[PDB]
Structure formats: C-alpha cells, structure tokens
From a paper:
The main/3C-like protease (Mpro/3CLpro) of severe acute respiratory syndrome coronavirus 2 (SARS-CoV-2) is responsible for making 11 out of 14 cleavage events for liberating and activating the viral non-structural proteins essential for the virus replication, and accordingly, it is an important target for antiviral drugs (1–4). Clinically relevant SARS-CoV-2 Mpro inhibitors, including nirmatrelvir, the active component of the Food and Drug Administration-approved drug Paxlovid, and ensitrelvir, which has been approved in Japan for the treatment of coronavirus disease 2019, target the cysteine protease active site of Mpro to competitively block its catalytic activity.
Of the several proteins screened, Mpro with four amino acid substitutions, namely, T21I, L50F, S144A, and E166V (hereafter referred to as QM for quadruple mutant), yielded high-quality crystals, allowing for structure determination by itself and in complex with nirmatrelvir, ensitrelvir, and bofutrelvir at resolutions ranging from 1.71 to 2.33 Å. The structure of Mpro QM in complex with nirmatrelvir shows the inhibitor covalently bonded to Cys145 in the active site, as observed in the wild type, as well as various other mutant Mpro structures with nirmatrelvir. A superposition with the wild-type Mpro structure bound to nirmatrelvir shows that the positioning of the pyrrolidone ring occupying the S1 pocket is minimally affected, although a hydrogen bond between Glu166 and the pyrrolidone ring is lost due to the E166V mutation. The side chain of Ser1 in turn forms a hydrogen bond network to bridge between His172 and the pyrrolidone moiety. The main chain atoms of Val166 are engaged in β-sheet-like hydrogen bonds with those of a 3-methyl-valine group of nirmatrelvir that mimics the P3 residue of the substrate, as observed for Glu166 in the previous structures. However, the trimethyl (tert-butyl) group of the 3-methyl-valine side chain shows a significant deviation in its positioning compared to the previous Mpro-nirmatrelvir structures, shifted by ~0.8 Å away from the Val166 Cγ1 methyl group to mitigate a steric clash (yellow/green in Fig. 3B). The substituted amino acids and the surrounding residues are well resolved in the electron density map, except for the region including Phe50 (L50F) in the nirmatrelvir-bound Mpro QM structure that has weak electron density and is presumably disordered.
Author numbering:
A (entry chain A): 1 to 49, 51 to 303
B (entry chain B): 1 to 301
The structure:
Amino acid sequence: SGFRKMAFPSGKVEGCMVQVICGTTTLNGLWLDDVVYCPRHVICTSEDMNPNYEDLLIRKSNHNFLVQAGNVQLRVIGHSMQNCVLKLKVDTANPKTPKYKFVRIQPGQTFSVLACYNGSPSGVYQCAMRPNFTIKGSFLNGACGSVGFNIDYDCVSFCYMHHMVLPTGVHAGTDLEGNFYGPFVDRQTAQAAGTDTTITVNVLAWLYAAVINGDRWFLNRFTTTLNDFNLVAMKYNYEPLTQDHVDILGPLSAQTGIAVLDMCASLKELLQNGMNGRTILGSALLEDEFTPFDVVRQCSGV
Amino acid sequence: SGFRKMAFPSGKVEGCMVQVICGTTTLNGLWLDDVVYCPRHVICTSEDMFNPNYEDLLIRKSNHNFLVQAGNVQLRVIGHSMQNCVLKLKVDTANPKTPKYKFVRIQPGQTFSVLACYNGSPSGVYQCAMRPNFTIKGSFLNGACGSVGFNIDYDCVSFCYMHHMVLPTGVHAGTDLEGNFYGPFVDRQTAQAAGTDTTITVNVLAWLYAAVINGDRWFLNRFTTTLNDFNLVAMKYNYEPLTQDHVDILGPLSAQTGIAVLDMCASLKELLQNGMNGRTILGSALLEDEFTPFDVVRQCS
Ligand SMILES: *C(=N)[C@H](C[C@@H]1CCNC1=O)NC(=O)[C@@H]1[C@@H]2[C@H](CN1C(=O)[C@@H](NC(=O)C(F)(F)F)C(C)(C)C)C2(C)C
Ligand SMILES: *C(=N)[C@H](C[C@@H]1CCNC1=O)NC(=O)[C@@H]1[C@@H]2[C@H](CN1C(=O)[C@@H](NC(=O)C(F)(F)F)C(C)(C)C)C2(C)C
Ligand SMILES: [Br-]
Ligand SMILES: [Br-]
Ligand SMILES: [Br-]
C-alpha cells in the first residue's frame, strides 16, 4: 500500500563515516578495515586550485592528516592517491566494517546517499545516476566524502563518493576507486554536464507502480511496437527503450497483467497529450528515479 | 545545492528492531532496554476479527505464546502488559544498543522519518508528514506493523509513530508509542475512513523558501499582503490557516533569503489563483507541503 521514494537503511554506512582533516580543509572519509577513503582535494586549500595534486601530496606526511572517528583519533600510517580519491592507511581497523564491495553503477540505476558533514551523518535520500552521469542530490559545503550505496542481501555495495557541484546545480563524483562518473575533473574550472534525458524504463516502472496502487486512468486500449514507441520518445528527450528494458519490466507486467508494449502505448499518449490536469501517484510529472527493481521490491506481494 | 526529501539516518533505530511472533502472526517490535513494544493485534488471528476483545485475548495468552527474535538470538518474554493499543513485552535481555530516546506525540503538519521493517529486518527509510486528518502517506506491505516513525533532536531519538493499519484510500494510520492513535481510528478491521485532508500552508511556504535558496525565484513578485488577507484566499483552496506562530517559525528562512514572510505569502497567493504556469518548482509541478521549516533549515544550513 502506497508508493514512496525510499532509501536503504543507512546504519551499516553510518558506522564507517569519519572526519578527515588536512590543514584547514575538512571533509568526510569512509573507514573500511584499516583504510580511510576520501576525496583527494582534502590536501588543498583555497590557495591550492591547476590543482596540481602530485606536488601537494609529495610535501604531505602522515602527521598532516588528522582522522577522527567521532572523538577518537585514528593515526595515519600511510597515504596514497588512486585517481581522484585518497587512501589513508590507519593503524586501527574499523570494528564495524560491514561486508562490502566497490561497484560502478550504470546510468539509470538508483542508490542511497548518506549526506555527512564533519564526519557526522546528516540525512539519507534516494538518487539516480542520470544519463549524463550527474546526480540530483542535496549537498552543502563540507559534504565531500559522503557516499552513495546499495544494500544487496547483507552486502553494502558502495558506488558513489561526492566531489563537486556543477553550475547547473547537479552533482558529480567518482566511484570508490577515484574514477569520475562522466566527463568531469576535480578542479574548479568551467565544466558542463551535457543534455540530460529521461530514463524511459524507469517511467514505465513507475506507471506500473501506479497501476498496482489503483491509478489506472492513463491506460488505453492501444498497443505499439518498440520502434514506433522509440520514434515518439526521441522527440520528448526520452532515452530509447531496449529489449533488455522490456525484459526487466516483465515482473511488473506479470504482477499487473499488462504487456510492456501496452504500457508503452499508454506512455506514448501521455507524452503527446499531457495529463489533462490529472495526477499519477500524486505527481503532475512523470517520475523516472524508480528502477523496475525498486518497484518490484516496494510492491512485493500486492 | 539541491533539495531532496531527506530522512534522518536510521542506524540508531535499526538496532532496536526485532521480530515478534504470536502463533501464526508475525510483526515488528521496538526493543528499548529490557522492553519490546509492538502492536497488540499480534495476539489476534483472522478468527478474532469480529469483536476483538484484546483484554480477553491477552489474558488468555501467556509468555510462551510470544517468540521475540533479535536477529538469530531469541529474547525470552518474562512479562507482558497492554498500554492502550501497544503491547509491552518484558524480556530477560536488555538491548545494549538502546539509544537515548523519548516518546513524543507529534502534531499535524510535523514530519518524521519512517523505518519500514518486515520480520524485524529494516527494509527502507523515508520521510512522512502527519497529515491534518491524522493519516500519513506512507508505503507499507503486509507485516509492516511495528515499524516506527522518529525524529532525531540533538542526541535523542524521539519516537513518535508506530504503524498499525492502512485505510481504504491507501493512507496509513497508527499510534504514538504510548498506544494512543493519531486521529479517530481504532485497531480493528471495521469500516473506517480518514476524513477530508487539507494542505499544510506553513510547509508550502517553507518549501518556497527552499526553492529560493536553491535558485528558483520565478514565482517571486514585488507583491506583499497581510496575514488575514492571505488566509481569506488560502481558505478557499483548502489550505490550513496560517497563524502568527507559523509566521514566526518561518523567520529563519526569511532571514536567509531577505524575503519577508508576508511577501512569500503574496507569491503563494498568486500561485493559488493563477497556477504554476506550466513550470516546476524544485522539480515539482505541484506545491509540496511535507517539508517543515525545520526540515529546510536543517537541509539548507
Ligand atoms: C565538497 N566538499 C564540495 C561540495 C560542493 C560545495 C557546494 N556544494 C557542493 O556539492 N566540493 C567542492 O567544493 C569542489 C572541489 C573544488 C571545487 N568544487 C566545486 O564544487 C566547485 N564547482 C566547480 O568547480 C564546477 F562547477 F566546475 F563543478 C564550486 C565552484 C566550489 C561549487 C573541487 C576540487 C572540484
Ligand atoms: C500490519 N502488519 C498491517 C499493515 C497493513 C497491511 C497492508 N498495508 C498495511 O499498512 N495492518 C493491518 O493488517 C491492520 C490490522 C487489522 C486490519 N488492518 C488493516 O490495515 C485493514 N484495514 C482496515 O481495517 C481499515 F481500513 F479500517 F483501516 C485491512 C483491511 C487488512 C487493510 C488491524 C488490527 C487494524
Ligand atoms: Br516521495
Ligand atoms: Br526566471
Ligand atoms: Br488586515
């Protein structure tokens, strides 16, 4: 009953967040086993932009880094730069390290963000990797080091670490190996995201969520082909729908008795006519940050 | 940068969630120190749907009818009492991860984070508002009862909600942690209806301030108005009346934007009487009312 933008429980990640201080710069780190992962621009100041990280790191020693888990100080015994993240080796292993893995998500996938400041968790919310490799998050100054994650069984899959905000108000970051999502660099210079698109497979998953919860006015008796659908979808800046996407919506087709191409034809008419002052799941816009798997998980058993 | 529906970190509450089994019925409980709190209808079955005599059913139940499971460790019940619609199960083991907490009764218009759980395992977290009709617009499946809503005020977890039922319109109802329902609802399967809901005016205003802080300012005009004149219009659109308390609580956001509260009221009045001009505010084509002034301040610090 009901459908909400839902984040994963953040407990397993809260126990890994620490404060990383280097000189006057403070951000968050991720403490897993005896390593703290954090954005490399912690070694910079307003002075340090060409943010030539190589030089800045060379002049640093281990005592220049203060890692704080709450009030307990963790001693740094090593420091290394892997792409855009800094790996600080510490003498103490995190006793709350969950079973984890580092994954690189694809555009269209969703994840939970634990927004932190000064190593202290502030809030949790759900995001999606946009097609242009940005995310529409909520981050303030000092938020860098906050991570995005999924919980798969008992395993925390870390997929995002926050680095910067672009002039359009969207956010950009890396995986836990320091590799940015999208064509961005961790330097304050003129950078742009690129035209974003609507995640079509997710809109369809959300329309299936609407049917499961009673909203079914947008359903029509028409059907269509994938190519005919994609021809219309291109015009409205929608991502093209693939046969993989059709198969992943199968569970929702099974739960509703509505064929995917029948839902595609219902989506086609909504795009060309609008909602006529009506709402879908209490929204006057089409929502695209629910994957089919999110919908299946949330509507399980209805 | 950006504005999202943001829940509190749920870690402190995840460590209090347990499974309560009574016969064939399984739901969630809240384990604080040596007491487990759960909805009393865990002692019922489909048979008891007609005249559910909880007093009777509970006395007919003993301690061995309750199986409490914290992960794999079973907690033995050594006492049980019924406070209104919640059951207090005395257990032999105290939760070593019990946070500093208090039980509070929230007011309509206030928000809280919900930790949705099933079989004692936390599944997801999201933010909710206590609607003016004392329902909440949540997402719960079978077995979700016992899930709790909470706020974190400094170092204290303030528990304010325990989930009990879904109403025919798809909205949800529950009690505070003292067993007293929010709204005119009872914990039995009988004909119940929520009642006409209204829009939380002070929250819409706080959300308009959040949009201005984040760059959205097309709805800003040079107009202003009075409290009474605004309320005369808002009443027509099924908006809750704005009080001077609400005007004072929007003060922090007026300070952050330099926009007087009554000027933002005049912007909302125009939005109500003219529409949103096919435009969006913070990515919404409707006015949002589930962000309190505190939620915005905390997120936009
Ligand atoms: C991490 N602590 C912050 C997070 C930012 C601050 C405001 N909200 C956020 O999401 N990240 C930064 O300050 C990074 C950091 C230097 C500059 N920077 C930026 O986000 C800047 N933006 C850009 O350079 C742009 F637009 F190109 F993306 C800033 C102008 C400060 C907003 C580094 C190393 C990239
Ligand atoms: C707790 N585990 C469930 C949660 C429900 C199930 C589906 N989604 C939810 O939020 N609560 C219940 O099953 C409660 C429980 C008996 C009946 N009930 C209901 O929610 C029923 N609704 C009503 O009686 C109504 F409409 F009046 F609110 C039901 C018909 C099963 C949906 C008790 C003791 C209230
Ligand atoms: Br939502
Ligand atoms: Br404008
Ligand atoms: Br007046």
